[PDB]
Structure formats: C-alpha cells, structure tokens
Scaffold this active site. Structure first.
Site, PDB file in Angstrom:
ATOM      1  N   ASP A 119       0.855  -1.174   0.000  1.00  0.00           N
ATOM      2  CA  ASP A 119       0.000   0.000   0.000  1.00  0.00           C
ATOM      3  C   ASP A 119       0.892   1.225   0.000  1.00  0.00           C
ATOM      4  O   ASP A 119       0.708   2.170   0.765  1.00  0.00           O
ATOM      5  CB  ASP A 119      -0.952  -0.003   1.195  1.00  0.00           C
ATOM      6  CG  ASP A 119      -2.152   0.904   0.984  1.00  0.00           C
ATOM      7  OD1 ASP A 119      -2.333   1.419  -0.157  1.00  0.00           O
ATOM      8  OD2 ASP A 119      -2.895   1.116   1.968  1.00  0.00           O
TER       9      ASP A 119
ATOM     10  N   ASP B 154       1.804   1.525   8.089  1.00  0.00           N
ATOM     11  CA  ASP B 154       0.711   0.777   7.481  1.00  0.00           C
ATOM     12  C   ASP B 154       1.140  -0.346   6.576  1.00  0.00           C
ATOM     13  O   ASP B 154       0.918  -0.299   5.357  1.00  0.00           O
ATOM     14  CB  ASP B 154      -0.194   1.696   6.678  1.00  0.00           C
ATOM     15  CG  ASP B 154      -1.567   1.053   6.352  1.00  0.00           C
ATOM     16  OD1 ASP B 154      -1.748  -0.186   6.500  1.00  0.00           O
ATOM     17  OD2 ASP B 154      -2.450   1.807   5.897  1.00  0.00           O
TER      18      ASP B 154
HETATM   19  N1  LIG Z   1       2.508  10.292  12.379  1.00  0.00           N
HETATM   20  C1  LIG Z   1       2.085   9.011  12.438  1.00  0.00           C
HETATM   21  N2  LIG Z   1       0.873   8.720  11.914  1.00  0.00           N
HETATM   22  C2  LIG Z   1       0.401   7.461  11.939  1.00  0.00           C
HETATM   23  C3  LIG Z   1       1.225   6.406  12.557  1.00  0.00           C
HETATM   24  N3  LIG Z   1       0.515   5.269  12.442  1.00  0.00           N
HETATM   25  C4  LIG Z   1      -0.654   5.568  11.811  1.00  0.00           C
HETATM   26  N4  LIG Z   1      -0.725   6.877  11.510  1.00  0.00           N
HETATM   27  C5  LIG Z   1      -1.852   7.579  10.825  1.00  0.00           C
HETATM   28  O1  LIG Z   1      -3.057   6.798  10.887  1.00  0.00           O
HETATM   29  C6  LIG Z   1      -3.561   6.607   9.567  1.00  0.00           C
HETATM   30  C7  LIG Z   1      -4.233   5.263   9.386  1.00  0.00           C
HETATM   31  O2  LIG Z   1      -3.248   4.276   9.705  1.00  0.00           O
HETATM   32  P1  LIG Z   1      -3.028   3.041   8.708  1.00  0.00           P
HETATM   33  O3  LIG Z   1      -1.979   2.179   9.383  1.00  0.00           O
HETATM   34  O4  LIG Z   1      -2.584   3.530   7.330  1.00  0.00           O
HETATM   35  O5  LIG Z   1      -4.521   2.373   8.605  1.00  0.00           O
HETATM   36  P2  LIG Z   1      -5.258   2.029   7.214  1.00  0.00           P
HETATM   37  O6  LIG Z   1      -4.974   2.988   6.086  1.00  0.00           O
HETATM   38  O7  LIG Z   1      -6.740   2.099   7.380  1.00  0.00           O
HETATM   39  O8  LIG Z   1      -4.824   0.677   6.790  1.00  0.00           O
HETATM   40  C8  LIG Z   1      -2.317   6.732   8.676  1.00  0.00           C
HETATM   41  O9  LIG Z   1      -2.675   7.136   7.368  1.00  0.00           O
HETATM   42  C9  LIG Z   1      -1.564   7.841   9.350  1.00  0.00           C
HETATM   43  O10 LIG Z   1      -2.266   9.022   9.003  1.00  0.00           O
HETATM   44  C10 LIG Z   1       2.537   6.797  13.111  1.00  0.00           C
HETATM   45  O11 LIG Z   1       3.301   5.961  13.659  1.00  0.00           O
HETATM   46  N5  LIG Z   1       2.888   8.088  13.009  1.00  0.00           N
HETATM   47 MG   LIG Z   2      -3.694  -0.220   5.280  1.00  0.00          MG
HETATM   48 MG   LIG Z   3      -3.296   3.711   5.413  1.00  0.00          MG
END
Ligand SMILES: Nc1nc2c(ncn2[C@@H]2O[C@H](COP(=O)(O)OP(=O)(O)O)[C@@H](O)[C@H]2O)c(=O)[nH]1
Ligand SMILES: [Mg+2]
Ligand SMILES: [Mg+2]
Length: 299
Positions: A195, A214
C-alpha cells in the site's frame, strides 16, 4: 458528537485488553479505509480495524512487523508492536508513534533537486532490501490478487450483479477478460508493503525518509505491487514520473509491466469501490463505484 464518543470507547478497549496500560490522553489522528488510528499518551499509536475483511488482517500485519523488525537492516523506522489484541471481531495494534512529516506532492515540489534525489534513493533502497528478504519465515502471508478478484467477482454474481445495467456489466466483464489475459502476475514474487503511497511515508526535518507506516496489506505478492501508487497520476500522489524514476533507481524490473500492473489496478478501482460498499454495507460506495463506471465507458 461522534468522535468524542469514539475516543471514549477506544480508551475503554485499550485499558480493558492491556491491563497495565493507562490512557492519560487519546485523540483520533487518522483513518484509512481499514482502520482508525489513535495517538495515546502523545507517544503511542493504537489502531483498530473497522473494515470487514478477512484476507488482510492484524494477525498477518503483526507477523510482518515482527518479521521485518527482525530481518531488515535499515534506519527507516517502522511500527514496532508493543501491544496487540487480535480476535475475529475486533483487533488492536499498539506501537510507539513513527514521528515525522508525511510526504505530499506539495512538499516534494518545493524540495531541492538534491533532496528529491536522495529521497528517491531512500525509497528505492528500502524497497530493494525488503523485496530481497528471504521470506521463508512468513511464508503463510502470501497474497494472490487474481484469486482475490475472482472471489470478489463471485460475490458480485451472488449479490447485485443481475441488477446492474448493461454498461456496468460490460465494464466488469471487460476487466475480467483482461485480468485473465495479463501476464503481470507471471513475474517475481516477494514481500511487498503493498500500500506504498505518499501518505504512508514519513520525512525527517531534512526531508529524508525517516518512517514507513501501514504494512496492513503487506505480504508475499508481485514485486510490481510496491510501485502501483508511485506510478499513480493523481493529486494525492507525486506523479507517474516520480514512480518511473524510482523504478529506475530500484533497477532490474520491467517498467512497462509495472505500468501495466498499476493500470490494471486502476481499471479495477470502480469495481473495488462497489465491492467495498457491498462488503461493509456503505451504499454510498456502491453509488460512487457505479457512477465511476459510467465516467470511463465514455473515455
Ligand atoms: N505520524 C504518524 N501517523 C500514523 C502512525 N501510524 C498511523 N498513523 C496515521 O493513521 C492513519 C491510518 O493508519 P493506517 O496504518 O494507514 O490504517 P489504514 O490505512 O486504514 O490501513 C495513517 O494514514 C496515518 O495518518 C505513526 O506511527 N505516526
Ligand atoms: Mg492499510
Ligand atoms: Mg493507510
């Protein structure tokens, strides 16, 4: 007042599953199409899965982090799981926040050529080392995109397919025929982020690649997969030339096959949307997907 309510339930689930943990502060800091992400005690990220999907779940995501934190030699930080609760019905992962600034097309355009070239080198080198990892230890984390589309197409046929208009069916049926003809799956398989788009890439104060978040869709899949969004020509990604460039740094890869892979992914997007609407029952996604179909059958 929806988010005040969401933060309260999440605070509860964290302190319930993770006894020693105390949530002093908590805020919604992000949300993709799969999870909602909470910054807790201003240092931890707790994400939880709200989407209904079984193939891409937190079991595997945790396995991937733990694999990669063990086998990758890199100063690019990735999530490191300190808390996890996984069940079929509800999953939580907790890890120290990856600190940094998210890459955007906007940030990139005001970067010096020098900072642009080192960033592109960081990205290429991260992908090269991860695609190079002997993936025996997570061999169960294979992803078959063809087989997945097949199943999703079966889901259409068992649900709303017959009530689709002819040009909608033509669209779906044309994609299916292409998916069966393409050769892009006949290539090298390896562990991919899968992704890999700007919004997961963190930058330090020198505009250097400092973090990657992610790996929720990661697995053993086509090498091509990590270039899908880099090659994307939209307003949330930097541009096709950016992806073209990174493909050149990365080296030893058919750029034309890569482009064919993103274009196939691109063609699937309206269907993916409708499927996403059917699975999670968000009908405004069926609407959009269905409308997106019409906007492409008229080139
Ligand atoms: N700054 C920061 N943002 C995070 C972190 N983990 C998650 N995020 C935020 O949370 C959002 C969703 O997390 P994600 O792992 O991509 O979930 P998904 O897109 O639904 O699979 C991400 O797009 C980031 O905006 C981190 O360690 N640091
Ligand atoms: Mg994801
Ligand atoms: Mg994401």
């Amino acid at each position: 007042d929806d988010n005040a309510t969401n933060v309260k339930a999440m605070k509860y689930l964290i302190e319930h599953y993770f006894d020693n943990f105390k949530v002093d502060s908590i805020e919604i800091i992000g949300s993709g199409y799969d999870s909602v992400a909470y910054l807790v005690n201003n240092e931890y990220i707790f994400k939880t899965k709200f989407s209904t999907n079984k193939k891409k779940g937190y079991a595997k995501e945790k396995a991937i982090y733990n694999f990669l934190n063990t086998n990758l030699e890199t100063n690019v930080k990735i999530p490191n799981i300190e808390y996890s609760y996984i069940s079929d019905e509800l999953s939580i992962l907790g890890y120290k926040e990856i600190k940094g600034t998210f890459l955007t097309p906007e940030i990139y355009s005001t970067m010096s050529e020098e900072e642009q070239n080192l960033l592109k080198r960081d990205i290429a080198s991260f992908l090269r080392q991860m695609h190079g990892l002997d993936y025996t230890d997570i061999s169960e984390c294979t992803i078959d995109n063809k087989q997945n589309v097949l199943e999703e197409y079966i889901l259409l046929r068992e649900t709303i397919y017959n009530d689709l208009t002819d040009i909608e069916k033509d669209y779906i049926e044309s994609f299916m025929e292409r998916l069966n003809a393409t050769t892009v799956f006949e290539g090298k398989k390896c562990l991919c982020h899968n992704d890999f788009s700007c919004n997961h890439l963190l930058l330090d104060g020198n505009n250097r690649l400092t973090g990657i978040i992610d790996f929720g869709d990661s697995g053993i899949i086509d090498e091509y997969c990590d270039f899908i969004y880099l090659l994307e020509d939209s307003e949330e990604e930097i541009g096709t030339n950016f992806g073209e460039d990174i493909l050149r740094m990365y080296g030893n890869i058919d750029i034309e096959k890569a482009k064919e892979y993103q274009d196939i992914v691109e063609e699937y997007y309206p269907i993916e949307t409708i499927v996403y609407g059917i699975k999670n029952i968000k009908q405004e996604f069926i609407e959009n997907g269905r409308k997106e179909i019409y906007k492409r059958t008229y080139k």
